[PDB]
Symmetry: D2
Subunit: 414 residues, 4 copies
Amino acid sequence: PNEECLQILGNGAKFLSDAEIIQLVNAKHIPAYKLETLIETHERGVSIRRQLLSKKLSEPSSLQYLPYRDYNYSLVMGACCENVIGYMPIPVGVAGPLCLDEKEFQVPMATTEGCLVASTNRGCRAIGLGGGASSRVLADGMTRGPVVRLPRACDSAEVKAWLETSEGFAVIKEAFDSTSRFARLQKLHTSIAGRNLYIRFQSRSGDAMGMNMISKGTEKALSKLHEYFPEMQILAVSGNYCTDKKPAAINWIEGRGKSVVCEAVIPAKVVREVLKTTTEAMIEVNINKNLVGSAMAGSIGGYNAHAANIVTAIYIACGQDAAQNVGSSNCITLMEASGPTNEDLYISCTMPSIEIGTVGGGTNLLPQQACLQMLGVQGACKDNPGENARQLARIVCGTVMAGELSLMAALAAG
Amino acid sequence: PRPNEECLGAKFLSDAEIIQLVNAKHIPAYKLETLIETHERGVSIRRQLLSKKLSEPSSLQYLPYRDYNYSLVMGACCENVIGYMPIPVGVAGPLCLDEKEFQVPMATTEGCLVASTNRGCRAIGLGGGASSRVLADGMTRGPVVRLPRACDSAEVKAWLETSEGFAVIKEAFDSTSRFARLQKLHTSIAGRNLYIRFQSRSGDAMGMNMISKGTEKALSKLHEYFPEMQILAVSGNYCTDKKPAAINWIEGRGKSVVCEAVIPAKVVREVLKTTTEAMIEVNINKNLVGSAMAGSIGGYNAHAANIVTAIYIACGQDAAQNVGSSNCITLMEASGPTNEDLYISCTMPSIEIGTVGGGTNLLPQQACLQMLGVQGACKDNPGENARQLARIVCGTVMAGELSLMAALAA
Amino acid sequence: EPRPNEECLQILGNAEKGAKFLSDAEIIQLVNAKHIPAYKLETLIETHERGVSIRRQLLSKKLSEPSSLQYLPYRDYNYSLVMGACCENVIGYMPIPVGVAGPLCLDEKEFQVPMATTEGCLVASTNRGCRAIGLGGGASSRVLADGMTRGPVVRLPRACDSAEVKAWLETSEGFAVIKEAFDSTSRFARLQKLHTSIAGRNLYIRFQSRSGDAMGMNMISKGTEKALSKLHEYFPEMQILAVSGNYCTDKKPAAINWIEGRGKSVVCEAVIPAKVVREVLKTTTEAMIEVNINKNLVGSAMAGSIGGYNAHAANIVTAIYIACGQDAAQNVGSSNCITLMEASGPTNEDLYISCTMPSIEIGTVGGGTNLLPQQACLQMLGVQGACKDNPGENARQLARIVCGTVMAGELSLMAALAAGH
Amino acid sequence: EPRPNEECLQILGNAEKGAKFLSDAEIIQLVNAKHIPAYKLETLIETHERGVSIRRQLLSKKLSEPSSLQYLPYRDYNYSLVMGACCENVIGYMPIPVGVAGPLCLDEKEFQVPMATTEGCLVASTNRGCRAIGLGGGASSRVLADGMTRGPVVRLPRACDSAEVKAWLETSEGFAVIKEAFDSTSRFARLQKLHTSIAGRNLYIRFQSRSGDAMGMNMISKGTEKALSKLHEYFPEMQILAVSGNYCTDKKPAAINWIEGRGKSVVCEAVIPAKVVREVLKTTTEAMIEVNINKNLVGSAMAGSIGGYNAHAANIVTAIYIACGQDAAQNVGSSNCITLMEASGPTNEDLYISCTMPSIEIGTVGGGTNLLPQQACLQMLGVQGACKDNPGENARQLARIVCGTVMAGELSLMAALAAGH
Ligand SMILES: CC(C)c1c(S(=O)(=O)N2CCOCC2)c(-c2ccccc2)c(-c2ccc(F)cc2)n1CC[C@@H](O)C[C@@H](O)CC(=O)O
Ligand SMILES: CC(C)c1c(S(=O)(=O)N2CCOCC2)c(-c2ccccc2)c(-c2ccc(F)cc2)n1CC[C@@H](O)C[C@@H](O)CC(=O)O
Ligand SMILES: CC(C)c1c(S(=O)(=O)N2CCOCC2)c(-c2ccccc2)c(-c2ccc(F)cc2)n1CC[C@@H](O)C[C@@H](O)CC(=O)O
Ligand SMILES: CC(C)c1c(S(=O)(=O)N2CCOCC2)c(-c2ccccc2)c(-c2ccc(F)cc2)n1CC[C@@H](O)C[C@@H](O)CC(=O)O
């Protein structure tokens, strides 16, 4: 019945049944947003929402093979996802060992693309027999790129010139750096479009990817700049100048997050025996595919075979924002002849905008932390903040370089 | 635990028996892939062998692996498998698109994304619904061939542009499959190089493998007319697959889609907490001027990648294709009698998508496709489930654009 | 002695006298204190040179330094072909030095290439690259495509309506109706397959067609206006927003020109024996390829270039354009070029080079090519005017010559950079 | 009259006689029998004009039409400032019509802008845009940045070593040493913040610096060669591969110039009253915002443009550049412009407009600005030559005039398109 169920809620929600909580929502006694709190167990809230969603689907038995039980919804509710109806298993494979900077790495890769892990693994094997890869973090700084307007272009020119002064920058740094412990503002980058002004705030973020933090610092820095210029309107805390989750030449040219380089020398014997091609044939494909080919297609930053495959697989496995694959896959793969008789293959990848972290986001979840622990970069680095995030970026660049090696070889062979 | 020589089928052995067999070097580790009978147990032993090689051997404790269908994953989706990664799934809906109502699954770990998208759907719902059209459909592969001279590569270009030359190439390409039907070829020469862009429908598949087999067969036929042509690479980055490229933005790849909606001024005020005037000002100066100042090709939107990515992971798509599939331009305009209502549209020229093959063969991913009524192939109208899913992506993206842009305007 | 204003007006209105019977000072006296505005000088004065003379005198009194114009020449120039066709408010002309680089050994022919420039060493450097190609057995070129474009933006009431128009233009019957209208406007109007693009309820339509030997912009614009008039008959609520919506794309950087082409798409190539690379270019083939890979491909890529995969194609393109009466502002798109270099021949010491230029926007008729001095430069190359026996052949030959000269420019600059100063 | 070869050579190598004593036919005979090289005519002949005459005569009998140079003028031109400076193998000169658009009301001053062009209606269009600006209270402009660049490519044995070099250049003390070596080559050389980028073992270094009133390419390249020599002392395994690795980026389309700027970054603006938009421009404010949005922004975006969010900035840039002795090949990057338009004033019926041009590559000394006709146009604008008491001020002013004139030509072309016809 209806009105007797109503009273039991006032006196806990554990004493009702599934059907009786949705006898009170299909008939509208209680409204359909308060379910969140009333129920005490997290997994029962998900069950109820699956049953409510069930009623609206033409095929309600769809949900049966979408799993949901035995998952830790405590770290997900109010942090990583809303309207949660379960989870989506992504098969994880391992490619390694990856000999990178004198260590070995077993790299997890969440994908449903056949042969991708097997290909990457072969690439790691070739790198290993050639003495391993070396890599460097060239730069580190997440950004946010708001757009403010002033009454005139002459005004925004004066605000820009004031920001490029020592005194102006320092007042904006103080406001930015007071919001957070890792908020340390580097040189600004501005651009005028008439009376519009786009300001690129850049800062290291510890081991976090850093968008929450960079945003808070940006908001306070715009508030201080508003005191200094009261006529200034703050249009959008992001004006696409960052640039987050969209292709942009500013990320390719200035960097965003970690800028990283990676290299390796593959002996001629190893190129023939493992990779089934030659050094000549590899350089010929790299030149005419990754350079000339991408050039004919009108690419900015896409001078690689399939960096996006590897970045995405690692990102999903390691609790990253997979959407940031758009910019994070920016890569240029270079190949040339090397060694005494010019038969060995030098290879390098440069990825100037890897947006990555080992704290926050999906790295708070325990399964994702398992993959980060495989690599030895899980959570913050207590003695050198940001080194875990930098190490993971190095790993992605090296694994990307392994995947470039392997796929390019298979293409050169036929 | 019995001695090594006695155990030398696999089902009758214990875990520690197989492992001590490998560590004593009586049997290579790679030979276990074949010898072990059950797939779940092969994963279990690989995890245990792997764990000892880590500086933290307990690191795989919370990476789950039990009770999952590895029969659809081995030899199809993933290798060297050590488990699975659970991505939380939320629902945004109802999305009121083309007179139907969709409950859209989104696999994400970004807080507030699903909720934000959901508020956008609500706005579109009270605005009467969104409409959408597929404008084009054709996945591509862009191999590169070499001739001895640029004069010879120009010969091949002009030959492929003749109707008789294109006709024999189409015949070869189309013989490889039911759904392989070759539309107009696009070619560019760079010296003695020649980049040929094979475009064709692929039924309800995304069509990577299918277009590739048709491409190999077509290039073989081209080799009969031009024996000195060398196939340098079956992909010469001219497709373009999983890299940012203007060609995808200008010619399209996969499904080209448009979506639109008019939100009443009252709904913008009460649901989205802003005005039409303020939204448009932000759209102009963010998604047009801003993306222009940052040097964007195809990124004239706020966060289309967020929505594309979450849907793709939920629905068994190749999530690495969000690079090109997230290509979007969001327009906003004053509409209505007094210019107070909000016309919004999103154009997505290269949504790379499918509802058969790949990750859409796995059962949980199929559940999400089934929620939307697009799982599997369409017997009556081949390619209609895939087309419908592309329309759903564009419409959810538009709902995401609406909601985020509203929050930024306020 | 300059008569009062009123008496000078009587003379001006006297139809068998007019401005000829007035003094320069009297005309100026009439302009100062109005009666004649200034734009009416061109239509009132006996001869074209006197209008220029008077305009210069008026202008001079408005400047801080009244002798500014002294070394700006204006006399003895054929203003008859310029007034009302090439320029307005004319105060003189700017002489650009014309040098000559050649012979350019192209397709078993020889070309002496004129080059208007004020950049020191440009002609010499280009002339040396010509020498390398000549002693190397010469170069070969092909025109791969031909078709000037125009990209109007139109507007339907809804995105669904613009999609319907897009689909209708894609049917063979709807395309045939717009093709008939487009083609009716001029003798060379032949609409090739259409390219369209939706942005919501906007529809961008790239009309492409050959234009004989004309560059073809006025002609394509006229066919476009007629074609869109026909389209509105089928779609009455379509608004023609602009005849150019920047989808052409004319005189701005744009990836669509690079990918689809605009005007003449062209490729040129040569093989330079090791002997010639040494003696003429002062370097090796290995050095050249090293620079070519890491500057023109990798360097351009790091710079975020679209279509700019070359050393200085724009230097050559600009110098020929100015000499040959082209629109020099179309240097933006016409300079698009990718220069490739690989090892070849005996010890991998011969240099195979090629340039590919997909959007050379050029013509041997119309605009500045109606003027006799820039016609002299076209006559040098044997490409002046229209080709009666083979329409478009003169313009095609000029685009082949531009590509061949760019490659010579590339050869020579790249060799200087491969030496280390 | 024609003499044998041996008798001709003795008189030529005779100091007190020379080529003055030889005739035209005799010098041509020596060049044909290969005694003397053709490029050497520059230095052996007594008159510049006679060298041009003999060059023309040689050229003419190599051509299929021997009279093709008839209307290519060459006599009475001042070849002294050209020879050994601006052009080689000179056979004459190309007159480009010059016209005036103005007054351009910019920063409370008035400018009469010279424009070398052969495109009909361009000057008239631009003049109408000026008229509308002047009636709307004139235009204001600001120079946001000033700094010509050069982007060499160097190489290390490994990417890790080039990462070392990048880190070293980023420290305050490493940059101080490179700055000292750069600044020692000239008094105008003041090195700004260094931009670098790694591609494997390659390293692209963007040296940026003001150049006085010169465009500054030779000044920056010299300072770059000294700075790289100093870098080599600290990093001896470094190889300079090319002094330009296309990272500057000079005369090619590149996002780095759009984003970082090159030479003069400038912004102009104005507010045109609703009355003026109606009467002068034959349209409305609302109609032009709609066209600017869907053409110059959306349209350019659909075309795949980087930096080309404008109507025809390249027309204005090219025209002023040729008239004022600039390198017209540099309109490639210099034309970079985004044109924006909004409603303004108490009733939102007035037109706000702005143009932003981040990479104007310009100068009032060097190259073609040394020639007198080109200098005449510079004197028109009051910017001819080096400014004594405020170095760089003339080139900055000219850049401000170029951005204001572009804005004039944007207003005018955009209004015409918004109206129709
Ligand atoms: C790594 C991946 C599993 C893979 C491989 S593979 O791993 O090397 N291979 C070897 C043979 O057995 C199957 C597995 C290959 C491949 C297949 C045959 C010949 C050469 C290479 C292809 C492949 C690429 C372009 C084609 F046209 C068609 C197939 N792909 C897909 C890559 C794909 O995800 C991005 C790719 O499209 C990016 C690009 O190169 O444009
Ligand atoms: C949808 C998502 C959860 C979201 C939201 S939100 O859902 O709309 N919101 C409203 C209620 O408050 C909590 C969260 C917001 C946001 C937050 C505050 C004000 C306005 C908007 C931001 C956000 C964007 C740019 C910022 F600078 C800082 C925060 N994001 C992140 C989008 C992000 O994933 C791509 C974004 O970077 C793409 C872009 O616009 O450049
Ligand atoms: C052709 C032109 C006359 C020319 C030449 S030159 O003709 O080869 N040279 C030989 C020596 O005597 C002087 C004249 C050179 C040059 C000079 C020294 C070493 C190597 C080459 C340079 C030059 C290029 C890039 C530099 F960084 C610095 C000088 N330029 C300018 C080209 C210029 O207009 C586009 C160029 O910037 C495109 C590019 O390479 O980025
Ligand atoms: C300034 C120039 C002389 C000019 C003018 S004009 O000066 O305004 N006009 C006034 C009326 O008398 C004729 C000349 C026009 C024009 C013509 C008709 C309607 C509106 C404008 C066009 C023109 C533009 C786009 C067309 F599709 C076709 C003609 N052009 C050519 C511009 C051209 O050099 C760059 C242009 O192609 C860049 C672009 O807008 O994409």
